[PDB]
Structure 1
Amino acid sequence: APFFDLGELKLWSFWRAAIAEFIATLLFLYITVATVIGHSKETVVCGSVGLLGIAWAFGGMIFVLVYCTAGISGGHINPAVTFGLFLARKVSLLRALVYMIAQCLGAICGVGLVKAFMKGPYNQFGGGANSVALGYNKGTALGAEIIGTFVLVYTVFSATDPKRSARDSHVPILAPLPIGFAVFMVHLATIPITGTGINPARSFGAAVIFNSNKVWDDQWIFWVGPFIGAAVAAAYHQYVLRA
């Protein structure tokens, strides 16, 4: 695998993929984290969208954002997804790094904006950040993240279009709706355990704005968890020999 292919010299489009990933990840974090705070700060019992509403916000936004960005960047919005595709040789090392930089920067800004708009409740209620919940230990959280990310990266490899790519690249287009639903499904099982990471940029962004020691102690789980899940899904895609 070289570090880069001729398609990274199409600098106009490469720039635009990066921007697309950047903005999408912002949008992602803003809408989802704002749904979290608004639910946690509600005084009325059942006066909110509930944990259900919060799972839809994550799944729904991924659907919407992959829909919008699949023909521009490939619609990753998530370093573990970019990592998995990189393992499967669909992304060069150079586009992979440019993508995770964009995704993490975008993630920080979105959580940023959510704090700007409601600082009080943002800090009081966890700041949207991921961590090990009471009653589970680290290895459980890690297993949960490995397996949840496997479910998302396995759906992504089935959602790849074998013939169509993003503008001026060989990066596959992705069917937005199954991927969105997998995100949704994994939240309904994972919110009680880690809040659900399965997206290192989404976990990184909330750690950066929330800035708590508890949160940062846990943060390794949400890189290693997902990256391992991603790698096991790549291994599986290649072994059920199907790209």
Structure 2
Amino acid sequence: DLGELKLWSFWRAAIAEFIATLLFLYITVATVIGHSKETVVCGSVGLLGIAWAFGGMIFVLVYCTAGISGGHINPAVTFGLFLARKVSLLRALVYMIAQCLGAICGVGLVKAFMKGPYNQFGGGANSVALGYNKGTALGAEIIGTFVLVYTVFSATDPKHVPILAPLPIGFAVFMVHLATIPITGTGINPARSFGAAVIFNSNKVWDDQWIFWVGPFIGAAVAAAYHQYV
């Protein structure tokens, strides 16, 4: 289509996302830089804390948007739902733009607030973990994103975007970070990966960026399929 401009109710939805993806990148990267600025060892929340920031914020945010926009906060979630015709192309694109914009903004106030540490320690930016190759990173993003989007589909509440459960993704995000943080820093979310690439602006991070789009999009589509066979 291309004529779904049903006033008020939607150019709102795209703003529900915005503000959402914003406080998502804030909190998390606000906690990922918190990590490293560490003068003393075993004195921060630790990677476990980082994993919780990501999972816990997706639980909180999907709870808050749930019946307003649906609660995507993530272009690969939007893409999976699109690829099932559970949303339209126009809504999908509007959402993805609002998410990528919000993401950039979040890793901004982080920047201001926290200067020096932001460019001193990875900048929440996602690059391939020293040691593994691009194929491994990609594979880990695929599977990671599959776990997320498989949970979302089952998190689809049938009562024309659908509602979404949260404690499940809360967890479905948390879990993937526990496995995936070492290898890539864990993305599973093209807007999250894009935002910090824009703000951190490093050649190495831009070089790896394609993985954080292609891996999640594939993992997401593989979901619509698992939800096609069955």
Quote how far apart the aligned CAs of 1:27 are: 0.5
**Structure-2-length-normalised TM-score:** 0.98
Write out per-residue CA displacement over residues 42-64 of structure 1, whole angstroms, 9 at most, x where no aligned residue.
Answer: 11111000000000000000000
Write out per-residue CA displacement over residues 100-122 of structure 1, whole angstroms, 9 at most, x where no aligned residue.
Answer: 00000000000011001011011
Distance 1:72 1:162 in 2: 15
**Cα pair 2:142 2:216 within 8 Å, conserved:** yes
Calculate the aligned-residue CA RMSD, in Å. 1.1
> Where does structure 1 differ by over 6 angstroms across 4 or more consecutive aligned residues?
none
Quote how far apart the aligned CAs of 1:82 are: 0.1
Distance 2:67 2:201 in 1: 35
Gaps of 5+ in 1: 164-169
Residue 93 of structure 1: aligned partner: 89
**Cα pair 2:14 2:94 within 8 Å, conserved:** yes
Closer, same or farther: CA 7–65 of 1 in aligned 2, 3 Å? farther
Residue 71 of structure 2: aligned partner: 75
**Cα pair 2:123 2:200 within 8 Å, conserved:** yes
Distance 1:211 1:203 in 2: 12
Identity %: 100
Gaps of 5+ in 2: none
Distance 2:162 2:172 in 1: 18
Quote how far apart the aligned CAs of 1:237 are: 1.2
**Cα pair 2:2 2:90 within 8 Å, conserved:** no
Number of equivalent positions: 230
Quote how far apart the aligned CAs of 1:176 are: 1.1
Distance 2:93 2:140 in 1: 26
Q: Secondary structure at the match of 2:158?
A: strand
Residue from 219, 226, 234 that aligns with 2:216: 226
Quote how far apart the aligned CAs of 1:7 are: 8.9
Write out per-residue CA displacement over residues 111-160 of structure 1, whole angstroms, 9 at most, x where no aligned residue.
Answer: 01100101101110010011101110000000000000000000000000
Write out per-residue CA displacement over residues 20-71 of structure 1, whole angstroms, 9 at most, x where no aligned residue.
Answer: 0000000100000010001111111110000000000000000000000010
Quote how far apart the aligned CAs of 1:238 are: 2.0
Q: Which moved more, 1:54-63 or 1:39-48?
A: 39-48
Quote how far apart the aligned CAs of 1:10 are: 1.8
Distance 2:211 2:83 in 1: 20
Closer, same or farther: CA 135–31 of 1 in aligned 2, 3 Å? same
